[PDB]
């Protein structure tokens with residue numbers, strides 16, 4: 001029993017964190033094989049800025065050992081620093097780009113040293129509601145599938161509302177952001193509907209049934225209601241993805257939707273679900289199945 | 298900016314997780330140097346869970362009855378001893394991944410990270426607090442026994458909790474790494490119930506200071522309170538009494554934000570009376586009590 005916001009064990013990623021210094025700027029890098037990946041803002045015409053740099057301008061520190069940079073190249077908004085030493089702690093990994101609503105663990109780092117791990121979701125507006133201070137740039141987001149680390153996020157900046165913006169490991173930003181000092185704002189955010197439904201199934205699995213009702217709804221009627229409350233549309237793919245949870249609890253997805261509709265129009269009425277007075281949207285259907293079944297890494 | 302429930306990076310603990318099997322029971326062990334620590338109930342046959350005589354059960358065991366697996370390698374048990382509710386299995390190999398560590402016993406209200414494990418394999422990491430009723434509101438399934446709670450301030454891992462059991466209300470009970478249970482709990486299947494839980498007042502105040510540091514001030518008011526008047530009101534909402542120690546501990550946050558502790562205590566009293574009125578504080582519609590004053594300073598300042 002219990003339902004917590006749970007991150008993946010961070011060990012395989014901790015062994016990859018390094019400190020990258022260029023001039024007065026110090027941030028984090030991800031050392032995989034003989035390449036250190038970091039935000040290109042560590043060095044704006046980034047082709048012009050980068051051409052003026054030599055390998056010895058980049059100081060890379062892995063623990064108390066200084067790595068020697070033997071090459072450098074830029075791929076979108078990420079700088080790739082070729083080093084002479086392959087990271088002996090390089091796990092089996094992939095670079096994956098995630099979609100809004102997908103969750104991942106963030107290993108927040110400062111000066112190449114991991115300080116914390118937390119679980120978050122890529123918001124529909126492409127920001128993340130993270131917890132980052134100055135020096136956190138280069139901290140990474142990841143998932144673990146069996147023994148493989150899928151790197152999906154690298155932190156680049158904080159927007160004026162306190163939310164965070166970054167890229168996949170190929171340097172493509174999530175969202176309409178740029179790594180430049182200019183006026184940028186997070187768009188109007190929406191609730192990840194499929195995740196709220198998954199979290200309601202987690203509540204049912206944990207014995208919290210008060211919100212259940214005898215009613216069902218059509219997908220179209222649910223989406224008409226969901227659009228009114230700034231919830232993301234629920235697709236047939238989402239309904240299919242929720243199938244296993246629907247079979248385990250005996251509550252059809254559209255039956256759980258009628259519960260969600262009633263919660264949106266009437267509120268919680270002083271009650272809580274899994275210790276929360278708000279509908280939680282940062283657990284995917286896969287996260288719910290993984291936590292309510294105990295998959296290990 | 299931002300405020301998240303943040304766990305310590307679990308790497309230093311993951312390299313210590315092993316699987317311990319005795320008869321039909323399999324659970325997790327913590328392998329530090331040449332000793333594997335695990336719940337002593339691993340020697341129990343479930344039929345002896347109501348009134349187990351652990352000394353009697355352990356005397357009948359030999360080293361080769363304990364199967365310890367570290368990854369795909371079987372460790373050889375060369376000795377065993379019991380210390381309170383923890384079994385210590387001496388092994389013939391020191392864990393090369395043993396971090397710098399300490400065993401610390403925590404007090405109610407203290408927070409720690411949990412590395413939930415099954416079959417000696419880490420599955421997830423989450424943050425939690427030792428409730429005032431000495432239980433933890435964890436996320437654990439069968440086979441999670443032996444999973445540990447820890448803090449990693451600096452490069453040293455302070456082990457503070459080892460999971461032993463789930464109570465009928467879904468909450469969890471366990472011991473420190475010396476085998477002493479937190480609370481009045483026993484590793485017996487006798488009827489046991491968690492006492493009425495209360496809100497960790499000092500942690501709620503720390504979290505309100507975190508909200509102020511992050512730019513949120515809507516809940517502040519022009520009032521102050523005496524500590525006694527605050528406690529009289531606090532007790533009525535099932536909040537833990539706030540002591541002078543708690544007020545002292547909140548001093549640094551009070552100095553940073555410019556809001557005296559008793560002034561913040563008056564915002565809390567008003568929040569308890571009015572609720573949030575559709576508003577949130579740090580993205581929460583409930584008052585959060587699983588962040589200590591130390592966690593707030595660490596996350597908001599460094």
Ligand SMILES: O=C(Nc1cncc2ccc(F)cc12)[C@@H]1CCNc2cc(Cl)c(Cl)cc21
Nearest residue numbers: 001338437438439441461462463484485486
């Ligand atoms: O508490 C236990 N198991 C589990 C632990 N944490 C979450 C668990 C969730 C579900 C579950 F069925 C078992 C879970 C074990 C085995 C069942 N009984 C029992 C009784 C006593 Cl006295 C002791 Cl010390 C340990 C146990």
Ligand SMILES: [Cl-]
Nearest residue numbers: 402403404407
């Ligand atoms: Cl403590």
